[PDB]
Amino acid sequence: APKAKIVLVGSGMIGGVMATLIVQKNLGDVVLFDIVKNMPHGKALDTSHTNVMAYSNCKVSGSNTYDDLAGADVVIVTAGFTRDDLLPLNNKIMIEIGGHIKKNCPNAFIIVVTNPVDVMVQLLHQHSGVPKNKIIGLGGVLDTSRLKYYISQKLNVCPRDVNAHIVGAHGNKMVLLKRYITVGGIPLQEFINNKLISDAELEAIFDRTVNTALEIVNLHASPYVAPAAAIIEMAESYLKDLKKVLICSTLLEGQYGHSDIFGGTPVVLGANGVEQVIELQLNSEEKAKFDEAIAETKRMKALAH
Amino acid sequence: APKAKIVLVGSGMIGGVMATLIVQKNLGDVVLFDIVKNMPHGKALDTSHTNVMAYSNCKVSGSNTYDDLAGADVVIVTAGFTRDDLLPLNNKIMIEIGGHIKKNCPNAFIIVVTNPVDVMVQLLHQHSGVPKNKIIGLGGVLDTSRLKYYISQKLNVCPRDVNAHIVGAHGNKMVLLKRYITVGGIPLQEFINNKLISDAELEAIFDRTVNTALEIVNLHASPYVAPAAAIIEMAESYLKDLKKVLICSTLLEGQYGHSDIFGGTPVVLGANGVEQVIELQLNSEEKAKFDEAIAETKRMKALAH
Amino acid sequence: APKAKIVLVGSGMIGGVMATLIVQKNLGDVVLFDIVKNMPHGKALDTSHTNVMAYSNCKVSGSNTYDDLAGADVVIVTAGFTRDDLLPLNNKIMIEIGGHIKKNCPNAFIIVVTNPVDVMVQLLHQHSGVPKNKIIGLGGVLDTSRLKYYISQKLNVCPRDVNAHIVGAHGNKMVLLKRYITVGGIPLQEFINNKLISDAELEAIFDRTVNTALEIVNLHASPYVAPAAAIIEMAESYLKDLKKVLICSTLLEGQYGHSDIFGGTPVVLGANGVEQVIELQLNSEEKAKFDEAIAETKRMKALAH
Amino acid sequence: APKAKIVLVGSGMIGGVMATLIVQKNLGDVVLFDIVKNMPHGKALDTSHTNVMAYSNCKVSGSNTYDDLAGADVVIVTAGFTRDDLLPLNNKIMIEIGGHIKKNCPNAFIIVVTNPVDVMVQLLHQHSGVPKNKIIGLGGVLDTSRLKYYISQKLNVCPRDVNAHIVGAHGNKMVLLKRYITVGGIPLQEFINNKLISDAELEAIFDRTVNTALEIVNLHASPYVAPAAAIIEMAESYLKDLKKVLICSTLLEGQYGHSDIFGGTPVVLGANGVEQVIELQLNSEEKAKFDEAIAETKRMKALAH
């Protein structure tokens, strides 16, 4: 069928949730690839059955064979471990995967999740050989969903009606742009002026946003459901040609004064992949912060070769 | 059942589309009320069957009996004709309807569509006797969907990723705020600066937006599908408690310097109805325009008593 | 984009509803083709805007140019008038349309609605030249939605949980198979035995089902919303590769003892179009009825050449 | 808000998936209750953020406090361990939970998942004190989704277009009724007669269906995504008043010749909970099998008091 083939190179936690969500939305056939034997076949089996409950018809199969990447339309990479000691190592994993992407599905759209994602996405870009508009890393969508949500719960408005922008990198050096936050299209400042939300609050929310994954870990859980949903938001925008403005890690070719590196910025995802890279007209203050994010990305890139 | 009862006081064009959309989304039971005999029963019959195709269970019935308003949770008024000669006349229709709302379903949430809507919504507010937070008029959501769409098609981005604000009134005196237009959360000016969209273009789009209903009429059609979808967006936000920021006609109690009148402004619709009235921090220029819109509303209010 | 192009050859009542539903479900781009000047552009304009309310990105345009059929992936024909005097005439319309389909979009999937549909679908099959698995007529899905719904409202169960089969023809000679009606997978007889629904009731429902369009007309309405939803159910099954079992008019090649004619029967719609034609193992009694339906189809076929 | 409060007494694997699905469908607010400290707060945090990606507004919070059950509209119990040694023990857990349900939310709708579910559901029925129509156990929906899916993949039709019935018990003594399997409303026998599917195949599928959870476990996974989706299908039918025919564990009051026990049978879930208990008109052969299922349920009931 013209049905899209979506291969998940990594069938761990994020892997189960995406499979679940893809059937829920009838986005395409799913391959849960992993190097752990059998488990993917297991998850795939359990997942396959939801087709019934969902009025869906998406094949879900497992795989311990790289060559199942053949004909993949979308590929989503979560494979890897989890310090700077793991870098040369997740780098070896990206290198192996890109080899197989180039061999089996060079025209696939690629989304990288493996952390640190702005480093790792570039690594795979170079080894897979795909065009720059055909590969992005997860980051911005997830990070902003936290900023958007926290604010929405203070202002008692629909979460999606908060817009925000986080750029530069995923991780600790991510840049929260207080200047680009709106509520129902309206500048956030207006709501600060009305004493509906204070600057002190909003600063507590910013640190909360930056520290979320960590907050989740210390509560004896692990962040994987949000990551999943955001990845799928991006994937769906590719498959359905929605042209959503979504913040992802992508190849900078002069934006923000930066080149020959991947960094977080709003892009437009549609049928051609990255159809636009939107550059925010940052002031020097917010550009200084962007610079620190790109510098930490370069630093971990060197630690892996 | 706790299933909501949605009564459509008016089963003409907008009336058929809402019924269709409500079943599509399983929002509630529908009553197509009209004074035209039988027709509502007809539309209701045809509509009822889509329950099958939609995996839905919403009763859809017709009605030539006002007292079918009893127990309505939501009421949506499109009844009326279509000059200032029709005002004292659509006023007599609002007067009759409010009487029945007060008698049969005083705790209903009310949405007025009948034009001119900012006049007519106030008229019904006073005669039905419902609380100020339980009644709004259609206007802003529809008008902005046109502004949002036209821009989206120039910038090649997802329509919903355009946000805009139109206030003051529905109709010719509606106020387009160029200052409050964003794309993927980003100020529109940034995209003007990049020569992706020009000021001359955007001005052509503004006049297009203001003249749409008229453009549709001269193409030998009539605007009713968009009106329908927007009304339902508002209704759904009420029923589901979504707290969406939506621009509707509502009772001004000092905002924009205006009182004892209905005018278009972003509100938050949830379970309590109008849960917030958001006042835009307009400059004098945009406030002068707001004033002209409120003045035309007052002027047609007088022509009906 | 890989986004599907859906052309509606006929932009009247059924035409507006499908456009509406297609955007609602982000199924594809829509062309409202009609021979009436401008009107399609009008409907398309109004419809285009719902993209915003729906989180959708489907182009909707009008057309008075047959050659806009070029590259269409799906084509849905509602064009025509509405006696046996109109046959040689709607036949001339199918002949003109097939010419353009063969010229501009020979690989399109085709759905015929124009009545009488089992005659008219064959007419277009022969003049367009498309493969037998790439063209069906609306009938069964619509007719059964009425049978399913009426029963569901007596048994107080979800409408979709009623299954039924109507075959042979759309129209008065349609064959209701009482033997193939189930509720939640369970034979209807079981519910007759329990005195939850009587044979006399169910017979009243059968005549109701057969006479619905007529019942709708005498209530001063016209049946177009259900037709729309069912057409879209079929179209969606094609586009999404859902392999739904849906009753449509299709080319009989020996089933039910019939050949070289179109008649209503369950088929499976997926990516290859008609992927299976399911033949019901009818007893002689129900086959006698099938025969009368095919005979009326042949009879009106002759009246048009 | 009238927004429903859905409390998940158990925030393990099935627990994360339901939370995910409930936000996806904007079904209500979610409380992830568990006795494990913090973890529920963690999962809830991660989950809460998907509100953004989903256009949703469902609160998701954690809880280590039973009294958070207060005002719950729906309660879904997955708490417990996993031999007949664990019975008197999961029994002590049901006893504690029912105490809190009776105290805090006696009018809640209850769905039991804890295994063995037909035993455990009755246990909670007696200790919570809720009406018989307000409590069911998961079983039939999940089990049939496997039977439906496997068959659908042989016949190449949409999964949901297979209907089947499994009754009596969840677990090894579950009764597969070959006689009540249909495809697109049509008896399965017809498809056996056509040599599209054989009896030997279908028997392999039956044993597959019975052994699925076990098949999933030996592939180094655990069955939790399907269980989740089915539970939510049931919950959604309650909340939305869909009147779906769904097979669940419920109180038998003479059906199948059985009393004063819970067993699997098609029911109709709507606003009143269990609105109907449908009794299948089983022959003696299939009733003998039903009897063995009820006997194993009674046997494990005794092992817990």
Ligand SMILES: NC(=O)c1ccc[n+]([C@@H]2O[C@H](COP(=O)([O-])OP(=O)(O)OC[C@H]3O[C@@H](n4cnc5c(N)ncnc54)[C@H](O)[C@@H]3O)[C@@H](O)[C@H]2O)c1
């Ligand atoms: N970019 C982001 O916003 C973001 C957010 C959260 C997590 N993450 C990252 O995503 C990754 C995974 O998250 P998770 O929670 O699913 O982890 P997980 O450990 O549950 O899954 C990783 C899977 O990859 C497998 N694996 C190892 N080598 C492989 C290979 N060559 N091919 C296929 N699979 C291989 C593992 O066995 C495991 O199943 C991590 O690196 C994490 O840091 C990124």
Ligand SMILES: NC(=O)c1ccc[n+]([C@@H]2O[C@H](COP(=O)([O-])OP(=O)(O)OC[C@H]3O[C@@H](n4cnc5c(N)ncnc54)[C@H](O)[C@@H]3O)[C@@H](O)[C@H]2O)c1
């Ligand atoms: N506010 C907005 O953004 C907006 C947009 C478009 C249209 N409109 C307005 O909505 C109204 C209707 O639009 P439509 O296209 O559905 O019109 P329509 O003529 O097709 O429907 C109006 C219906 O009301 C009926 N009616 C008259 N008196 C009635 C009564 N007392 N009770 C019930 N029904 C009664 C008519 O018979 C008719 O069926 C008009 O006044 C129009 O100006 C408003």
Ligand SMILES: NC(=O)c1ccc[n+]([C@@H]2O[C@H](COP(=O)([O-])OP(=O)(O)OC[C@H]3O[C@@H](n4cnc5c(N)ncnc54)[C@H](O)[C@@H]3O)[C@@H](O)[C@H]2O)c1
């Ligand atoms: N098969 C079914 O189950 C079923 C059910 C209901 C209605 N119908 C049939 O569908 C058809 C239309 O239904 P409707 O309610 O949309 O009717 P409608 O009159 O509102 O629409 C028909 C449209 O076709 C146009 N037309 C005429 N010649 C044309 C051409 N060459 N190209 C494009 N358009 C042309 C007309 O101007 C009109 O806009 C009728 O023939 C009716 O009998 C079929």
Ligand SMILES: NC(=O)c1ccc[n+]([C@@H]2O[C@H](COP(=O)([O-])OP(=O)(O)OC[C@H]3O[C@@H](n4cnc5c(N)ncnc54)[C@H](O)[C@@H]3O)[C@@H](O)[C@H]2O)c1
């Ligand atoms: N009926 C069915 O069709 C079906 C299908 C699959 C699984 N199950 C059953 O569902 C149950 C759980 O499945 P899972 O995969 O989510 O298991 P899980 O172990 O991941 O979750 C069970 C949770 O309950 C907790 N718990 C223990 N006592 C508790 C209490 N008093 N209150 C709240 N939580 C408590 C545990 O800490 C754990 O988080 C099992 O008993 C299993 O056998 C039933």
Ligand SMILES: O=C(O)c1cc2cc(O)ccc2cc1O
């Ligand atoms: O959830 C996150 O945001 C996140 C972020 C990061 C960043 C990073 O650099 C390593 C690992 C993780 C793991 C995570 O789960």
Ligand SMILES: O=C(O)c1cc2cc(O)ccc2cc1O
């Ligand atoms: O579609 C519209 O925007 C619109 C607006 C107005 C305004 C008005 O004042 C009268 C009638 C209409 C009718 C309409 O259809």
Ligand SMILES: O=C(O)c1cc2cc(O)ccc2cc1O
């Ligand atoms: O709605 C229907 O079922 C229907 C059926 C038929 C059958 C027919 O033969 C001509 C016209 C119509 C028009 C219709 O609207």
Ligand SMILES: O=C(O)c1cc2cc(O)ccc2cc1O
């Ligand atoms: O998935 C199932 O069907 C299932 C069934 C059963 C039955 C049972 O008796 C105990 C535990 C389980 C666990 C499970 O996961």
